[PDB]
């Protein structure tokens, strides 16, 4: 009973820290933390190896709160187990500048592994984390030197499992046989709209079994022995595991089993009743020293990490080259990058130039993983020397995501979050729309995921308007902390990859053609490193043609038509708006002189071009199913129209 | 033996029209049409009730080609059955201005029900087609008067079934019990990357059974009796059915069961080898009169439609008032609508004003269907008078989509395509990212879906940066054929709903606040009908503050702030860029006088504002977890910052 009592006291400490933090904030989600407190207790106190003094310990188990609304469950248990998350931060839940935002933010709170809140993201990203652990173990573990060994745990809600992305990621995790991915589903039969049976009556565990997962059930979350057994059963199984855990949202309160418990403070009445019902004599934010002593993980964390560091030292002696490579990759340190582009001797699509740059870069980047959402021969993402990842071949650095852009985005993010890898994946730019929430989450977390987008324009031709981007470029450019690089040619494409790989602050979208475009000079194209540059200057510029990607070549042909009529314009290549705006004002003004009329050319929406141009040759309608170059010309992309647009300003 | 010959002959005419059209285009996808010809034969010749003479017959069975790449399968069979699709259009497959674009485009080809090509869209949109038939049948059918009675057939590929949207949509179709939805999956074990077992080994039919679908197997697509069998089994069942149909991609060619058959022309050798293996003597685009006569559905089509026309007249006699409402709704005519807004007395969020507008509008609009992706209490999308749709209550006009924005998008499109309904659904503006391809597919098709998006800015407060839109407004405004209306207040919100309901050309996004904002004059707010208007003029304006939604109120505060220092600016409300752009230039230049310095104010990305403004008070970073008004103020939306930005111009 004193074991039981201390378990029950510690669990209620989790419940009441969450209840009282929501109440003081008058904002947040007390209901799921109230139900799931026992699981958070069990993971952080007994099951997981982790170090509250070093949240970045590379061999820690990873916990993902996919059900991010339940943030106070995680803050309470970080606080109680000795992470640097003081009580004062729990009393500033949801307040400006606090380490306790409404939804978990990786980088803002120690021990937060993934930014969650958008449902389906945590559970999907966790497939990446587990795939990262599996592949790094395969790469580095040696007989008697187990240097990579950790689990990926997830707490997911009904919402997570309704989102298509979680089903895409689950199909892949099962295909991949990721045995160390263990997901707990809070089966509490309640969602925001009320009872789940308004919208959600599928056989969830039957679906997960169809994906090749193990399913287990725990009939009462409050029964710690039933949770321990299910977890031990999960660790013996070669399949990823979903454990259905029945709970009562708002457990112990008069809002128990109600959607009203989901998303608003309990109120003083229901807080007083929960106190009485659960036998909690402690006032707000007071937890007795007994629980803190019981929950302190600082000493077990120190000992776990020290045992790992001692295992690393024996590794460094038995295998110094492996050890040095592991430490370099775990630190996120790139090796020296080539400064010389590949050799091009004829026109080539920027997708193929991209495949050529990867052939150069991959052999010198063992951390570099590639893939495609079933567009491998269309995206040029499988570098020479890369082989397919599979259960049978855990060392392959190439991932077949299938027709799953969204889960591809989430898995790339998890691969990039874990440490050890740098991952890119490919699809068509139009199908960036299938993965937007994963692109935004990489931007929010500052995760340098590289998104490769081919078939960037109407120039892709016959596949027609459902495949032809229009709004895509400006829709991505508007997103904070996303570089969008649209190389004009094979040479720009090489510099675009160096920019993307060296950018650690957030994601990069690489935007590439299907159709072949001419070469530029390798010396001129290095200007991509400044985001925008003068490609072809003239004496006493009367104006500027500014262009991106494929349209730079249209711009150069228009520069010749104007030069034949005695009008002198320079051509600026603007491969990246973001990298150009980061340049000194003096540089930006040298490139685009104040007072000179400017025409922009880009086969995409015009909205945003007024930032740089007085007139734009752009596409503000959907495309057409026709061959290139006819479709391009008849939708207005001719050098005669760029010229005419320039002559209208002078 | 001679029936059999005419079936084999008609099936091969479908294969060779597909092969030869792809060959002449030198572009497209011969492989899936080759395998699936038997199915196309059977649907269009025997199973389906359709009229080639009238593709708009409202009681026709609907066929959705979800696997849009296989467009020539549909084009061949529409041609063969006597649809208005001449041989000359097949000869112009994927050519400029042709009626045979590379992917099916609704309104460009007679008998094409949905624009497809983005995988997952057709199978998902089909759920809305089936939901509309089911509800219209419940609303209008009377004893001895079946005026609504038709099936929704889908052809889907592996790629459709890996896409998470198809899982979301299948979960809802099984929950809803949509028995007359019948999906055929081309189980050919090939995708673009090679064998499906590179990335796709789940038990698909076990997953579909977990959704509450019937699942059937046809071991050989060429066995027409097995197909007839499965379809009869589907029509007897009270569940949506998935029929796994095994086929060889590139059936009868040297490229059979190869990814090479997927997406390029067979080439001359493989064409010649296919004519031999299948014993097809006829040169390209030649089909024997024998087949045209067997496949001609014009007589049976007219007979089916006249029978329905007869039953409608009999309905008009028995049920004059129902018949009138049905015909009005089938034609998409609005009944008269209230002309004055709800009466408001206090500060109110535009989400609550939207709820008040729907309470006024819905009772006049029996066609109007509402919904939310599990945010019903947050989005104010359940009008007073609406009840939940469910299998037991097929008459409810309110749809609980659960946490499925993407399938909600597609289902709304299905409902709005079918005829008889106008459908809207709500989520938070940030979660438009989860449904973007269905938003784009509404804009491509010109389907007037109304997307309700609340929680439009950092002003939503504590839920933090994962919930707070930044890029979303401009990301949506860049998209062709989408109105984005961001009403300033309760009164603008009523006119926004009128604008959306009356716009039939394409979709409308209504963008609404979480937080209360003040009321404007009822009469002033009518200016929303012109997209942009002068809200508060002054004498001899020295400049303009232009603003949208909530920031209109910040702009009036900044106007008053500037007047207290002798500076006179007008305030323009720009609730819609697209409706303002559509006004005469003379109006636009009355609203924004050339020469006058313009400061814009919007709590979203700056990119795009240069089209209207010289300086923009905007947000180009992710938000923060803190209460409103503090979060809005500390991120730089103050009257002092707006005045400061105008004084840095004047
Ligand atoms: C993609 C996405 N759509 C919508 C929401 C809004 N939202 C937050 S919590 C939630 C669902 C709550 O139900 P459940 O996930 O079962 O949570 P519980 O209250 O049972 O923990 C919703 C719809 C979201 N967070 N993410
Ligand atoms: C959402 C989406 N992502 C990617 C594509 C590109 N694409 C077109 S067809 C296809 C898959 C082809 O495999 P499958 O669907 O099995 O077709 P099959 O060759 O068997 O007809 C792909 C990835 C697409 N059309 N839509
Ligand atoms: Ca729940
Ligand atoms: Ca296939």
Explain what you see:
With 650 residues, chain A is of the alpha/beta class. Chain A has three domains: 1-326, no CATH class; 327-529, no CATH class; 530-650, no CATH class. Helix content of chain A is 41%, strand content 12%. Chain A has 25 helices and 18 strands. In chain A, the strands form four sheets. A six-stranded parallel beta sheet of chain A has the order 9-8-10-11-13-12, sandwiched between helices. A five-stranded parallel beta sheet of chain A has the order 1-2-3-7-6, with helices on both faces. Chain A has a five-stranded mixed beta sheet with strand order 14-16-15-17-18, covered by helices on one side. In chain A, helix 15 links the parallel strand 8 and strand 9 (398-400). In chain A, helix 1 packs across helix 3. Chain A is elongated. The relative contact order of chain A is 0.09. At the A-B interface, helix 6, helix 7, helix 8, helix 15 and helix 17 of A face helix 6, helix 7, helix 8, helix 15 and helix 17 of B. One calcium ion binds next to strand 4 of chain B.
- The value of Rg of chain A in angstroms is 27 Å
Bound ligands, named by name, code or SMILES:
thiamine diphosphate, calcium ion
Distance between the termini of chain A: 89 Å
Global geometry of chain A? elongated
Question: Roughly what percent helix of chain A?
Answer: 40-55%
Number of helices of chain A: 25
Query: How can the largest sheet of chain A be summarized?
Result: 6 strands, parallel
Task: Give the amount of beta strand of chain A, in percent.
Answer: 5-15%
Assembly state of the chains shown:
homodimer
Number of strands of chain A: 18
Most extensive contact: A-B, 106 and 105 residues
What class would the helix/strand composition of chain A place it in? Answer: alpha/beta
For the largest beta sheet of chain A, what order do the strands appear in spatially? 9-8-10-11-13-12
Give the number of domains of chain A: 3
């Amino acid at each position: 009973k004193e074991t039981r009592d201390l378990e029950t006291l510690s669990v209620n400490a989790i419940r009441f820290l969450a209840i009282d933090a929501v109440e003081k904030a008058r904002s947040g989600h007390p209901g799921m933390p109230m139900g799931m407190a026992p699981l958070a207790y069990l993971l952080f106190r007994e099951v997981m190896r982790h170090n509250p003094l070093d949240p970045d310990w590379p061999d820690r188990d990873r916990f993902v709160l996919s059900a991010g609304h339940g943030s106070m469950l995680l803050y309470a248990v970080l606080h109680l187990t000795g992470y640097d998350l003081p009580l004062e931060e729990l009393k500033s839940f949801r307040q400006w500048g606090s380490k306790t935002p409404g939804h978990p933010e990786r980088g803002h709170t120690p021990g937060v592994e993934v930014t969650t809140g958008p449902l389906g993201q945590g559970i999907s990203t966790a497939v990446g984390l587990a795939l990262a652990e599996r592949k790094l173990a395969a790469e580095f573990n040696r007989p008697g030197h187990v240097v990579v060994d950790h689990y990926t745990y997830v707490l997911a809600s009904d919402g997570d499992l309704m989102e298509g992305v979680s089903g895409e990621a689950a199909s892949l995790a099962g295909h991949w046989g990721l045995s160390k991915l263990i997901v707990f589903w809070d089966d509490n039969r309640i969602s925001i709209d009320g009872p789940t049976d308004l919208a959600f009556t599928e056989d969830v565990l039957a679906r997960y079994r169809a994906y090749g997962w193990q399913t287990l059930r725990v009939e009462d979350v409050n029964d710690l022995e039933a949770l321990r057994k299910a977890i031990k059963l999960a660790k013996l199984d070669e399949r990823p595991t979903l454990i259905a855990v029945r709970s009562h949202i708002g457990f112990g309160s008069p809002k128990q089993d109600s959607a009203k418990a989901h998303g608003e403070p309990l109120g003083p009445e229901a807080v007083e009743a929960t106190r009485r019902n659960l036998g909690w004599p402690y006032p707000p934010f007071v937890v007795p020293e007994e629980v803190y002593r019981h929950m302190d993980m600082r000493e077990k964390g120190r000992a776990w990490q020290e045992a790992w560091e001692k295992a690393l030292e024996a590794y460094a002696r038995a295998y110094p080259d492996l050890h040095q490579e592991l430490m370099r990759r775990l630190r996120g340190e790139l090796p020296p990058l080539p400064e010389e582009p590949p050799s091009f001797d004829k026109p080539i699509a920027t997708r193929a130039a991209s495949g050529r740059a990867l052939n150069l870069l991959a052999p010198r980047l063992p951390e570099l993983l590639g893939g495609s959402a079933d567009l491998t021969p269309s995206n040029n993402t499988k570098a020479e020397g890369m082989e397919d990842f599979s259960r049978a071949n855990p060392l392959g650095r190439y991932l077949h995501f299938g027709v799953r852009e969204h889960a591809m985005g989430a898995i790339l993010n998890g691969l990039n979050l874990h440490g050890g890898y740098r991952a890119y994946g490919g699809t068509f730019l139009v199908f960036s729309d299938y993965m937007r929430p994963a692109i935004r989450l990489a931007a929010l977390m500052g995760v340098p995921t590289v998104f490769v987008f081919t078939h960037d324009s109407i120039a892709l031709g016959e596949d027609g308007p459902t495949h032809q981007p229009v709004e895509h470029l400006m829709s991505l450019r508007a997103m904070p902390n996303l570089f969008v690089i649209r190389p004009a040619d094979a040479y720009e494409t090489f510099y675009a990859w160096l920019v993307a790989l060296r950018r650690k602050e957030g994601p990069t979208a690489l935007v590439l053609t299907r159709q072949a475009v001419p070469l530029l000079s390798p010396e001129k194209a290095r200007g991509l490193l400044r985001g925008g540059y003068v490609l072809e200057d003239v004496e006493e510029p009367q104006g500027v043609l500014v262009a991106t990607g494929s349209e730079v070549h249209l711009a150069l042909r228009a520069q010749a038509l104007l030069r034949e009529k005695g009008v002198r314009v320079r051509v600026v290549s603007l491969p990246s708006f973001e990298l150009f705006a980061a340049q000194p004002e003096a540089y930006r003004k040298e490139v685009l002189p104040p007072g000179l009329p400017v025409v922009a050319v880009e086969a995409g929406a015009s909205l945003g071009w007024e930032r740089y141009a007085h007139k734009v040759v752009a596409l503000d309608r959907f495309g057409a199913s026709a061959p290139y170059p006819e479709v391009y010309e008849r939708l207005g992309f001719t050098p005669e129209r760029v010229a005419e647009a320039f002559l209208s300003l002078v």
